[PDB]
Structures are given as C-alpha cells and as structure tokens.
Amino acid sequence: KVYNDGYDDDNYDYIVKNGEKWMDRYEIDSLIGKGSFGQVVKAYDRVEQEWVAIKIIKNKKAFLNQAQIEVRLLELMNKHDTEMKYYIVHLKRHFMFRNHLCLVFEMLSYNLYDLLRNTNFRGVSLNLTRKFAQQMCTALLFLATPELSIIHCDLKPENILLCNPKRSAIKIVDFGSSCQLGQRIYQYIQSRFYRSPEVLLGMPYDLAIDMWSLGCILVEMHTGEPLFSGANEVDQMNKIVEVLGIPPAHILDQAPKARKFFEKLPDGTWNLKKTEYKPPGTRKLHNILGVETGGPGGRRAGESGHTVADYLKFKDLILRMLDYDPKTRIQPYYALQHSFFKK
Numbered sequence: 001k002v003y004n005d006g007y008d009d010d011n012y013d014y015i016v017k018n019g020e021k022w023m024d025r026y027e028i029d030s031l032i033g034k035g036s037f038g039q040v041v042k043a044y045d046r047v048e049q050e051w052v053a054i055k056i057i058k059n060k061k062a063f064l065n066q067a068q069i070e071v072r073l074l075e076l077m078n079k080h081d082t083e084m085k086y087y088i089v090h091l092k093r094h095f096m097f098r099n100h101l102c103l104v105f106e107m108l109s110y111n112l113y114d115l116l117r118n119t120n121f122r123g124v125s126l127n128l129t130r131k132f133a134q135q136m137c138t139a140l141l142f143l144a145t146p147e148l149s150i151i152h153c154d155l156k157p158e159n160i161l162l163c164n165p166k167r168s169a170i171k172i173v174d175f176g177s178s179c180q181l182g183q184r185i186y187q188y189i190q191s192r193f194y195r196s197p198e199v200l201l202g203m204p205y206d207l208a209i210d211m212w213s214l215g216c217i218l219v220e221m222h223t224g225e226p227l228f229s230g231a232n233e234v235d236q237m238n239k240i241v242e243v244l245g246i247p248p249a250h251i252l253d254q255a256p257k258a259r260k261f262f263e264k265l266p267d268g269t270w271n272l273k274k275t276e277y278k279p280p281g282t283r284k285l286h287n288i289l290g291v292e293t294g295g296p297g298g299r300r301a302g303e304s305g306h307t308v309a310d311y312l313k314f315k316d317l318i319l320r321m322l323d324y325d326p327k328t329r330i331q332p333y334y335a336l337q338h339s340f341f342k343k
C-alpha cells in the first residue's frame with residue numbers, strides 16, 4: 001500500500017526528507033513540530049533569503065478545512081494596520097504542494113515551555129514575566145478588536161514563542177483551534193490546565209477565556225509549575241476551588257455542568273462533591289507566589305524587582321484575570337493600565 005504517490009505516510013502526513021527542495025524555492029532542513037493537524041518544518045526560502053517555518057497540513061478534507069479557517073483568521077489579522085499585530089505569528093504566504101496545504105510563517109525561537117524546562121521548572125524572574133504579561137495583554141487587546149473578536153482558544157506556554165533567543169519579545173502562534181465570537185458551537189475547548197471555569201461548567205464563553213488562560217500562564221512562568229495541574233476536569237475544578245473557593249451561586253445556578261463538580265444543598269448554596277484537596281480558597285495565591293517569603297521556594301530572596309510591593313501588584317493583577325465571573329474578569333485594556341506595568 002502506497003499513499004499519495006508515495007509522498008504521504010499511512011497517517012496522511014507528508015514524509016519530510018531533509019535536503020528536499022520545493023518549487024525551486026524552499027529547502028527543507030528538519031521537522032520542528034508535529035500534531036494531529038500535520039507537521040512543521042524549518043525550511044530556507046531562497047527567494048526572501050531567510051529561514052521560515054512551513055506548517056504542512058496533512059492530506060485530509062477535515063484537516064484542510066480546519067487550516068482554511070486558520071488562514072482566514074491569520075489573513076484577517078494581517079490586514080489590520082495597528083502595530084499590536086506584531087505580537088501575533090506572521091503568515092508570510094500559503095500554497096498547495098503535493099495535495100498538502102502549506103502555511104509559511106516567519107521563523108521564531110524557543111517557546112515559553114522550553115524556557116520553563118531550561119530552569120528545571122523553577123520559573124523565570126518577575127521582571128521577565130512582567131515583559132511577557134504586557135506583550136500578552138497587548139496581543140489579547142488586539143484580538144479583542146470588534147472586527148476580529150478572535151478567541152485563541154488554546155493559550156499555553158508551548159503556544160508562546162520568543163522572536164529571538166537573546167531578546168524577550170514574544171509572539172502568540174497556532175491559531176489552528178481559534179474561533180471568532182459567536183454561538184457556543186464547541187464546549188470541550190482550551191488545554192485542561194488553562195481551561196476557564198465557563199468551559200468546565202459548559203456555560204457560554206467569550207474572549208475572557210484567553211484572559212483566564214493568561215492568568216494561569218503568568219503564575220506558571222514565575223513559579224515554574226502549572227497553577228492548576230488537573231488529571232481530569234473534576235481534578236481541574238477542585239484545584240481551582242482550592243485557590244479561589246466555590247464559584248459564586250449566581251454562576252453555578254446557570255451552569256449546565258454545575259453538578260459534575262458541585263451539589264446544591266437544600267438552602268440553595270453549593271458545596272463540592274467528595275470522592276485529597278485543601279478546604280476551598282485556603283491555598284492562597286499570596287503563598288503560592290511567596291509574596292513575603294522571597295518568591296517561589298524563596299529562590300528570589302534579595303533579587304532586584306522582587307520586593308513585597310512588586311509581588312502584591314503581580315498578585316492583584318493575577319486575581320483579576322482569575323475572576324470566576326467572565327463579565328467582570330479584567331479585560332486587556334484595563335490589565336495594561338494596572339500598577340504592575342507602571343515603571
């Protein structure tokens with residue numbers, strides 16, 4: 001059995017060969033990414049005389065249609081004049097090659113997960129996470145443009161990449177799972193660790209879910225570990241409840257999946273269901289961040305920009321991004337006016 005005249009494997013993925021030359025232009029070096037969508041290769045563009053990342057979408061109608069949505073979103077974002085658009089991965093061009101849709105992006109550096117791994121999961125300076133926080137807040141403000149109204153829908157350290165390994169400039173990549181504001185067509189969305197309470201409770205979701213994701217990411221970038229590392233959605237909700245407490249009754253009364261996690265007592269109030277965790281809201285973020293104990297594991301004791309005053313500004317902003325209420329959860333514009341960013 002051969003697939004696509006021997007160009008494709010059995011999983012519809014194009015068989016990447018180091019040194020192969022496409023259309024007398026792109027020279028493939030190596031595979032730099034993989035997923036259900038297909039693969040990503042480092043290639044040299046002979047025309048522009050620069051390195052590019054080519055996202056080879058696997059030869060399947062389902063995966064091609066998903067990529068077409070991604071291309072439309074990227075091209076729509078590219079059209080906007082604002083210089084906030086330079087916090088989003090730039091799609092240079094897209095073409096069909098041997099029955100594969102190929103998205104040519106600008107070549108970037110390491111993602112923030114590789115960064116966390118370089119630290120052995122002890123996290124980066126509060127000064128660096130502030131630089132990341134402000135760029136991310138600007139990127140989410142850009143996606144918040146009414147004409148775009150884009151929900152990234154899969155924000156995580158892996159999907160945030162450095163432009164340059166010796167600069168702190170970041171770009172959000174992978175809009176392959178993205179939607180624009182609209183009917184709640186999907187419900188199992190976002191990576192588990194960065195999944196908003198809305199999605200967990202199966203309630204309608206807006207652009208605020210990306211802000212929840214950001215809150216979870218920035219704490220992780222400082223401490224080194226995911227704030228909420230759930231083995232399942234029930235474990236996920238319980239780990240959120242440990243830090244933030246029981247979500248307000250007004251939210252859970254409207255929540256279709258409320259009773260997956262909580263039981264409604266005869267007095268109208270909500271408790272957890274038992275099956276292991278701290279009492280609700282007793283794993284204070286004050287302690288996780290180490291506000292008064294020299295930061296995470298006391299590893300930032302005596303470091304410049306790691307004062308109690310600096311940590312309190314950070315904690316205030318993170319608690320505003322992790323507001324259970326998506327309608328009062330802090331929006332990108334207001335997050336950018338926060339004292340955490342005031343020099």
Ligand SMILES: C#Cc1cc(/C=C2\SC(=S)NC2=O)ccc1OC
Nearest residue numbers: 032033053105106107108109173174
């Ligand atoms: C490694 C890498 C890598 C990935 C991208 C972009 C992607 S990957 C994806 S899936 N969706 C995108 O938009 C862009 C540049 C890169 O070079 C480090």
